[PDB]
Design a protein around this ligand. Structure first.
Ligand SMILES: C=CCNc1ccccc1
Ligand SMILES: [Cl-]
Ligand SMILES: [Cl-]
Length: 162
């Protein structure tokens, strides 16, 4: 198991524009196109990202290309973040995957506000952090996924991903 596989599991793969769990235009492997509700604003964004006139549709390869850049951007986001960086480097390799998963899903910003959990994770207080993490909108809106990540942080293994 690795980050790619992990996230491929959590976000799935769609070749046509779609609406995410929050109602936003997205494509491929969880790639967010726009928060706006204009489908057209969405296609424009898609074309810009792909570099061609997609008409709302993409190829596998293309999706995967966006995914790569996307994984990449997130780690790099983590790395640059002062609040995040130090936590991330104090983790082992599996738990780091769990951090990238959340940042992918919610942005560096959202994660940056999980102050208390951040701290708990830093101190290696697994069970404590897991309970903390659950006390969030994130858990409440996307419980199944959230549970997976949390068990990830919690145990340090891929059990949740079986
Ligand atoms: C507490 C939330 C975990 N998320 C997170 C993200 C990046 C680095 C370290 C931790
Ligand atoms: Cl792009
Ligand atoms: Cl879910």
């Amino acid at each position: 198991m690795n980050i790619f596989e992990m996230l491929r599991i959590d976000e799935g793969l769609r070749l046509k524009i779609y609406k995410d769990t929050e109602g936003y235009y997205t494509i491929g492997i969880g790639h967010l196109l726009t928060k706006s509700p204009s489908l057209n604003a969405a296609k424009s964004e898609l074309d810009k990202a792909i570099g061609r006139n997609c008409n709302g549709v993409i190829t596998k390869d293309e999706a995967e290309k966006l995914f790569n850049q996307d994984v990449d951007a997130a780690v790099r986001g983590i790395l640059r973040n002062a609040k995040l960086k130090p936590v991330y480097d104090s983790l082992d390799a599996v738990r780091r995957c769990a951090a990238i998963n959340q940042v992918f899903q919610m942005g560096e910003t959202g994660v940056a506000g999980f102050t208390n959990s951040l701290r708990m994770l830093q101190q290696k207080r697994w069970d404590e952090a897991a309970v903390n993490l659950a006390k969030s909108r994130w858990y409440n809106q996307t419980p199944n996924r959230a549970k997976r990540v949390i068990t990830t942080f919690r145990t340090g293994t891929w059990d949740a991903y079986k």
